[PDB]
């Protein structure tokens, strides 16, 4: 498929926000398709980069990266101070089927809403 | 939160394959926690390892999903190949609650968008 304006719903702590992000080109050097949110300032906008490579085995990489604006004293242009990252990689092999890959994808997707990862990430209290 | 039997529903293309998994110990050397299902085999079971860190907080989630095969002239089965999955979160010390929750939920929801399911299921670029 080709890039399109992707609108993610059901996002946030309270689960009411939603964000619309649109494509912003593909880097020819390494095929890292990029998506961004229209935040009116290029350096203060959320970013997503997705890229699948070619072989012995395949590799799918997703990098989410978003900053937090901070109003510096004595200046009007805000500067990026805190920077949250997120990395995801999948490493299926050649002879793998497709139902197995879908199983991995859906399992990881549902694991991120389980009452385990909620405490793992929101409060950072380790599983014990 | 102490480890508890995690159950997941509506997994896969059909949205019907349910999966139940329970904790299977905590490694003390590196402070990781493990989860698996009971497949009556030492190896051929899906497993998930989760671990947070203590300082640039780092949260890591790894998934191993192996397959089985009937080896030629072997009583026992053998693992042929396994799908991996790795997830990394790298917040900083002054991170707030809302921002981290935003990152988590965005990564979760984006994983079911048509773009990314098409990227994973058919393995094609954009």
């Amino acid at each position, epitope marked *: 498929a080709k890039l*399109e304006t*992707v*609108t*993610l*719903g*059901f996002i*946030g702590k309270d*689960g*009411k*926000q*939603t*964000l*619309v992000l649109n494509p912003r080109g593909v880097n020819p050097t390494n095929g890292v398709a990029s998506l961004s949110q229209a*935040g*009116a300032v290029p350096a203060l906008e959320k970013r997503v980069t997705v890229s699948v490579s070619q072989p012995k085995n395949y590799k799918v990489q997703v990098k989410i990266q978003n900053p937090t604006a901070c109003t510096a004293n004595g200046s009007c242009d805000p500067s990026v101070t805190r920077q949250a990252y997120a990395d995801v990689t999948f490493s299926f092999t050649q002879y793998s089927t497709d139902e197995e890959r879908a199983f991995v994808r859906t399992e990881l997707a549902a694991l991120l809403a389980s009452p385990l990862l909620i405490d793992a990430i929101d409060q950072l209290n380790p599983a014990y | 939160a102490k480890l508890e039997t995690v159950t997941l529903g509506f997994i896969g293309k059909d949205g019907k394959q349910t999966l139940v998994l329970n904790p299977r110990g905590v490694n003390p050397t590196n402070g990781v926690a493990s989860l698996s299902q009971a497949g009556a085999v030492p190896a051929l079971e899906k497993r998930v390892t989760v671990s947070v860190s203590q300082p640039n907080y780092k949260v890591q989630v790894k998934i191993q999903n192996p397959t089985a095969c009937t080896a030629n002239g072997s009583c026992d089965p053998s693992v042929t190949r396994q799908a991996y999955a790795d997830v990394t979160f790298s917040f900083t010390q002054y991170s707030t609650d809302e921002e981290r929750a935003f990152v988590r939920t965005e990564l979760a*929801a984006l994983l*079911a*968008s*048509p*773009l990314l399911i098409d990227a994973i299921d058919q393995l094609n670029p954009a």
Partner: antibody
Amino acid sequence: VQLQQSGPELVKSGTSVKLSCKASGYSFTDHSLHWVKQSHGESLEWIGYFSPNNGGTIYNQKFMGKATLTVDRSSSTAYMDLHNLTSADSAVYFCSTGWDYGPFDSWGQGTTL
Amino acid sequence: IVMSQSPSSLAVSIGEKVTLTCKSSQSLLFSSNQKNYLAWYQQNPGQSPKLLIYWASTRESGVPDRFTGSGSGTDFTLTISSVKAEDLAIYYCQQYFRYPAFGGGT
């Protein structure tokens, strides 16, 4: 979060009326402030909203001529004007807040005309 | 986007499985992932309304589990676990993406 709406007025003729919403408990950094009009009975229509990330000057149709929106960030309050009023000023106008594209969660008490 | 609602008022008596039906003029799967964009509001005749159900199937904190909604592409239901002493008054259905719009009554 909590917002407050100030005062009912009963002026006649369609010259100009000032309706002000005293917003509190948040900032206009991300949230959007809507101006749903309840009219009378059923069929309460949406007027407009002020989003710094969406433009803040979006108006529902058949209302552009008789509606203007301005918001000041110093006092963290919003207030709108009605250019002409003959019978569309039937009843209460409501003030509500929410996320960018999210639903309308918390509404202040209304003032009728 | 124009919205249509169930007949004006039901004949709710007591303890029955009354379901309010809202049918849309256009599919509300704007979101890339399969999440609808409807909300349900209750409006007592005296004071300001309140939000009940959003994303057409998810409750919000402060509402009993008695309420439930079932989502589809363009036709939706609000099923209530029977009626109790104070759950009366006008119930509103809203799509709230891009251009919002209300419609209908009880």
